[PDB]
Design a protein around this ligand. Structure first.
Ligand code: SF4
Lengths: 36, 116, 808, 242, 72
């Protein structure tokens, strides 16, 4: 079934964006390096 | 805490009475045919049973099965080891044979601790 | 160039005072108490240069250390005043001050000059200089001279001057006295009277600002005609929690560190990291929870942080020091990691440890073999190509430019032979010395080249090793094809213990390695191997018993174990649970030695700029010149001085004797000529100015007197003629000779017998006249005449000789 | 030629080959192939009677190729500017690849070419003209994966401009010339022995082996003479006094 | 063959079609998704044909001639 897979994928991406924008992720380090 | 032992006798027919075993072991393979065996908890074997009944008083047995899947009871099918048993969810079905009696299939799980 | 100013401290003339007050905030918490003027800076220029002199003259300041029990700063005097009235005398020492109110803070005294002038016999007008003092008393004291003020000038309308006096802490009462320190004048024409007409006293402000360090600076307003200067200090800073057996100055270690803490000053980043992680006001445990920090690891970090290692120009020095100041709000993680980057030590865990481990030449702790991982398998991965660098750029806070940023690159030659140029940029976080920046750069340069990560997953053994423990790997795959790595054994201590491996022959090497449940792995020399059955006998002796089916490893000189550093451990659920994923990186046992001996830096050379003290003119001379125009005499005023380096445009200013300074317009000729200056007494001083605008100090007062017309000698009048042919009248002729165009009159003396004792004055004729007839003679009477010249400035001339007369 | 064969509805067998160049560092050039080689029953009987089995080699352009399995990942030519890294996979059984990676620092800067042609276009001696080909070139960057079975590599192109800041003539005080173009070369180093040799501590040595003088102005003041002209690159006073 | 679509989720459903025809759907999906509007100043095909990072940039000459978003 693709509907459950799609729902799980979007939820996982929503959690991933918060776990990456927090302390330690690539985007956080990139922003810290650039803006400073 | 008025427990009620299962009644209406027992019978074996149409693949009924077969037991089932469930374990809780985890093992990891190292290499060269080496393995490590471990168990979480106390390594209890949750026995399972299937019962098929046909008789005149099928309605009372159906009522008992429907009303006793939340609270446990006692029932000793093959050997006399008394156990704390409870009916599985959505595992009760009826088959018709005659205008007076019916066929009922139920499955039992063994519960440990709690007892209420 | 440098900012302009002018030191003004010698107030003695009629001039008002305007002051500026600035109060600065210093780091939170307790600070050292060393606030000397040599450590206070204006525009990165020190105020007092050692012994030297004063760069910015006349500065008043006071400082506080920043504790709970401070005392309020007596500056910022506000909230009006009271002001009484009285005007008695300041000659025979009257007047007293009898304040009792303990809330009183300061007292202002205003002094009045009704008339100050002075005259001479010639009628010229000069000034008068007078001296006063102000004295405290205190309960039973010597009156403690405090304030000294000078007043001069020529006045006809009055002069006001209000001064400020600060009270000392007392118990019952304070007495102030007003005294005069010059002899009092007389009825002679010298006017000098002192009047005091003020009792301006008031509280100032009771704002002592507890828990914060302070700084109060006072100066005058004339000194800066442009942007005010940035104020800074150079001194020690926050008092940190220092261990017991530790002397910060001498960097000693008594031994047996027992956990007791004291308070002192330190630069070791090990102890100013612990201070940040525990402070409740501005630290890490803000939500009133006592967090746990491993003190022993920090003590070992401190011990490593003070090893003596020379570099640069010899002179062994500590290898890591940190002295930083924080002025902007940043995320706590950024600050913590920036501070930790000095160690380059790992940090981890959340609840029970909060620990830091420095990279040291550590010893192995646990053994992992092909029989202690899942699917007997190890994975190998590496770093990207862009991560291998050759040069790194490091920022600075340099000492010799006085905390201005600089650049020092770090480069390794060997890495440049294969890759090319890969450049980084790392901002240093407080290294004030160039050598430590180079060491920090070489740290990353050396560690980035060697990175061969090896990963694997194990069973319950993962609970034993933690992050930072160096582990040993005896993988068969990377060690060619020979194995010598199983988990058999059949005996405990028996002596070579048969040690029958159920399969695999294994061969002869140096030592066999066992894993003890708690302690470090133990290696014993595998001698008398006796591999007759190829699988019998290994060792000589052993300690403690050993379980069967235990792990072991064998090493050789040609093939040995591989050391790695554990960095991450992970856990599973519901199918893995008891497994533990582990990763590791390649260990390096010799990079520190290469780091400690690979830096070379000479110094920061000096530069050519304007000096902070422009020299004053060396010597000054005052002379004159004369010329004769329109009968009268005209003088001139001449000044000169040596051309002093670092000085463009001069300044000349002079008065009569004491009255009031007047400014001669700015000149660059190095010499000043002013004509038509009237006779009297005069004084001259000359400053110096540079291109920027910074004016130097005042010169030495040079006084001169202008008598008149260069001095010069008069010239006697020639050819006095006496004749004897005029009936009834006696006459006389003459000739006023050259340079006599300033004659005020001639002097005519007439003796009767050529004796100078018998010569008497007769008449005094006008300059536009040379002849004289004197009719009242008798016949044949003989007379004599003497004639001289007097000039306009009443300068006389030598008498002539005596000529004879004979009437008809 | 090959375009005409490709432009038909029923093309024949197609071959792909890989070679790795490492002669810059002193590394041998390797060559691999697949496609499976059939064996005749007569050869089987000869092997049975004589008891030997020789491995099969294969002769294409230039010199022959080895027998190793491999695999290639996505290859794209995008004009949008995004740079994609394809992945290599090489089977590893005899640990020779692992030993190569260990000894030669992962053979990072290597040149790889990929050749695609048709089997019957090749003459019996493995010589084909340049009238038709398909050649792709990449450079290795990292040995992504190493195991007992499969070793994996990543590839890029000179279009990957990560890092590489354009203006890098920074106003430093440490010998910018002796970072990129080193000593004794005519670019910026005019030092021809002159006043002997010196070492890391600027100590005077006489052998032509231990020579090293990094950065510091004193070094050259010594190498070039006190008052003589200097080839130093960079200023002594990096920044003005505050 | 017949194409019964699912309204809720089309991105993942489209890939499941084997049909020897998923390649066109994948290509169209990528090409169309690259052009979707966001919060960037420059538009679409102007980026895909020849990229140019666009944005107004002013050098600073004085601190008292640089306005703001009406703070003070
Ligand atoms: S000072 Fe001269 S010789 Fe020495 S590294 Fe610099 S450019 Fe080369």
């Amino acid at each position: 079934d693709p509907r459950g897979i799609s729902q799980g994928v979007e939820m996982m991406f929503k959690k991933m964006i918060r776990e990456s924008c927090s302390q330690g992720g690539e985007v956080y380090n990139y922003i810290q390096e650039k803006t400073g | 805490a008025t427990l009620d032992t299962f009644g209406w006798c027992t019978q074996v027919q149409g693949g009924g009475g077969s037991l089932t075993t469930t374990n809780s072991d985890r093992s990891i393979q190292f290499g060269n045919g080496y393995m490590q065996l471990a168990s979480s908890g106390f390594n209890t074997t949750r026995r399972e049973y299937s019962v098929v009944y046909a008789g005149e008083d099928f309605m009372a047995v159906y009522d008992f099965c429907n009303s006793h899947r939340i609270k446990p009871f006692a029932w000793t099918p093959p050997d006399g080891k008394i156990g704390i048993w409870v009916v599985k969810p959505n595992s009760l079905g009826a088959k018709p044979v005659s205008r007076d009696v019916m066929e009922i299939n139920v499955t039992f799980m063994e519960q440990f601790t709690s007892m209420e | 160039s440098q900012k302009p100013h002018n030191p003004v401290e010698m107030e003695d003339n009629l001039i008002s005072i305007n002051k500026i007050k600035i109060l600065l905030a210093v780091s939170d918490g307790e600070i050292d108490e060393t606030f000397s003027l040599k450590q206070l800076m204006f525009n990165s220029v020190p105020v007092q240069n050692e012994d030297g002199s004063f760069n910015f003259e006349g500065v008043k300041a006071e400082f506080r250390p920043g504790t709970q029990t401070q005392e309020y700063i007596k500056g910022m005097e506000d909230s009006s005043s009271e002001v009484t009235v009285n005007r008695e005398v300041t000659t025979d020492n009257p007047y007293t001050i009898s304040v009792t109110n303990k809330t009183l803070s300061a007292i202002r005294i205003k002094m009045f000059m009704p008339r100050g002038v002075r005259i001479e016999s010639n009628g010229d007008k000069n000034g008068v200089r007078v001296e006063y003092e102000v004295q405290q008393a205190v309960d039973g004291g010597s009156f403690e001279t405090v304030l000294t003020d000078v007043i001069e000038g020529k006045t006809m309308s009055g002069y006001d001057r209000s001064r400020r006096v600060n009270l000392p802490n007392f118990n019952n009462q304070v007495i102030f006295r007003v005294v005069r320190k010059t002899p009092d004048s007389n009825d002679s024409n010298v006017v000098d009277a002192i009047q005091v007409k003020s009792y301006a006293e008031v509280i100032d402000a009771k704002f002592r600002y507890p828990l914060t360090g302070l700084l109060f600076v006072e100066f005058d307003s004339k000194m800066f005609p442009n942007q005010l200067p940035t104020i800074s200090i150079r001194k020690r800073w926050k008092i940190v929690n220092v261990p017991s057996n530790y002397d910060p100055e001498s960097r000693t270690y008594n031994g047996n560190w027992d956990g007791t803490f004291k308070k002192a000053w330190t630069n070791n980043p090990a102890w100013v990291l612990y201070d940040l992680m525990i402070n409740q006001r501005y630290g890490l445990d803000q939500k009133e929870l006592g967090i746990a920090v491993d003190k022993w690891a920090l003590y070992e970090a401190a011990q490593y942080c003070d090893q003596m290692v020379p570099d640069g120009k010899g002179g062994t020095e500590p290898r890591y020091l940190c002295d930083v100041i924080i002025q902007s709000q940043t995320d706590a993680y950024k600050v913590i990691r920036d501070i930790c980057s000095i160690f380059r030590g790992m940090s981890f865990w959340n609840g029970e440890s909060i620990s830091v481990i420095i990279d040291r030449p550590r010893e192995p702790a646990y053994i992992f073999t092909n029989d202690n991982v899942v699917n007997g398998d190890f994975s190998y991965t590496f770093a990207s190509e862009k991560s291998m660098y050759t040069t790194c750029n490091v920022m600075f806070d340099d000492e010799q430019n006085m905390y201005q940023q600089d650049v020092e690159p770090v480069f390794d030659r060997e890495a440049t032979l294969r890759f090319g140029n890969n450049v980084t940029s790392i901002t240093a976080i407080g290294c004030t010395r160039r050598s430590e920046a180079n060491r920090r750069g070489r740290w990353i340069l050396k560690t980035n080249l060697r990175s061969t990560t090896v990963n694997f997953a194990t069973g319950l053994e993962g609970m034993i090793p933690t992050i930072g423990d160096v582990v040993a790997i005896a993988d068969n795959f990377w060690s060619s094809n020979l194995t010598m790595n199983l988990s058999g054994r059949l005996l405990e201590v028996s002596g070579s213990q048969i040690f029958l491996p159920f399969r695999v022959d294994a061969r002869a090497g140096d030592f066999i390695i066992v894993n003890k449940p708690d302690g470090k792995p133990v290696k014993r020399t595998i001698s008398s191997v006796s591999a007759d059955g190829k699988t019998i006998e290994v060792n000589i002796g052993f300690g403690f018993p050993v379980k069967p089916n235990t792990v072991f490893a064998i090493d050789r000189t040609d093939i040995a174990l591989q050391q790695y550093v554990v960095t991450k451990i992970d856990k599973g659920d519901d199918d893995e649970e008891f497994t533990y994923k582990i990763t590791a990186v390649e260990y390096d046992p010799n990079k520190y030695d290469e780091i400690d001996y690979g830096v070379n830096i000479d110094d920061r050379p000096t530069s050519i700029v304007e000096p902070d003290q422009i020299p004053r003119p060396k010597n000054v001379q005052v002379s004159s010149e004369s010329r004769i125009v329109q009968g009268m005499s005209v003088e001139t005023m001449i000044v000169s001085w040596d051309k002093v380096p670092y000085a463009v445009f001069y300044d000349v200013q002079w008065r009569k004797d004491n009255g009031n300074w007047q400014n001669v317009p700015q000149t660059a000729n190095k010499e000043v000529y002013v004509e038509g200056i009237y006779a009297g007494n005069y004084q001259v001083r000359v400053r110096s100015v540079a291109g920027s605008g910074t004016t130097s100090g005042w010169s030495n007062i040079v006084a001169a007197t202008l008598t008149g017309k260069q001095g010069e000698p008069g010239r006697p009048i020639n050819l006095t003629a006496t004749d004897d042919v005029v009936f009834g009248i006696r006459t006389k002729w003459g000739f006023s000779d050259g340079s006599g165009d300033t004659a005020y009159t001639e002097l005519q003396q007439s003796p009767d017998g050529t004796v100078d004792n018998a010569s008497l004055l007769s008449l005094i004729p006008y300059p536009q006249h040379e002849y004289y007839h004197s009719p009242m003679p008798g016949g044949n009477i003989v007379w004599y005449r003497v004639r001289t010249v007097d000039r306009i400035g009443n300068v006389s001339q030598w008498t002539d000789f005596v000529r004879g007369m004979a009437s008809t | 030629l090959f375009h005409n064969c490709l432009q038909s509805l029923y093309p024949g067998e197609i071959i792909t080959l890989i070679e790795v160049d490492g002669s810059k560092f002193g590394a041998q050039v390797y060559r691999f192939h697949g496609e499976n080689i059939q064996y005749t029953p007569e050869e089987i009987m000869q092997a049975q009677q004589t008891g030997t089995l020789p491995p099969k080699e294969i002769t294409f352009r230039g010199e022959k190729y080895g027998a190793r399995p491999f695999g290639i990942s996505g290859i794209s030519f995008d004009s949008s500017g995004k740079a994609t890294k394809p992945q290599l996979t090489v089977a590893n059984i005899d640990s020779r690849v692992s030993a190569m990676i260990r000894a030669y620092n992962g053979l990072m800067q290597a040149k790889v070419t990929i050749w695609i042609t048709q089997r019957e276009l090749i003459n019996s001696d493995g010589s084909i003209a340049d009238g038709a080909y398909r050649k792709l070139v990449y450079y290795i960057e990292r040995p992504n994966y190493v195991d007992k079975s499969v070793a994996r590599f990543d590839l890029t192109s000179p279009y990957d401009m990560d890092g590489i800041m354009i203006p890098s003539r920074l106003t430093q005080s440490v010998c910018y010339f002796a970072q990129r173009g080193w000593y004794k070369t005519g670019k910026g180093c005019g030092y021809n022995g002159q006043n002997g040799y010196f070492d890391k501590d600027n100590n005077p040595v006489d052998d032509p082996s231990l020579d090293f003088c990094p950065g510091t102005v004193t070094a050259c003041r010594l190498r070039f003479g006190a008052n003589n002209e200097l080839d130093f690159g960079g200023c002594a006073v990096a920044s003005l006094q505050r | 063959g017949l194409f019964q679509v699912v309204l809720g989720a089309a991105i993942m459903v489209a890939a499941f079609y084997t049909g020897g025809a998923s390649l066109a759907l994948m290509g169209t999906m990528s090409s169309s998704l690259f052009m979707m509007g966001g919060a960037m100043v420059l538009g679409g095909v102007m980026q895909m044909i020849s990229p140019q990072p666009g944005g107004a940039n002013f050098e600073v000459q004085s601190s008292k001639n640089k306005p703001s978003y009406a703070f003070g």
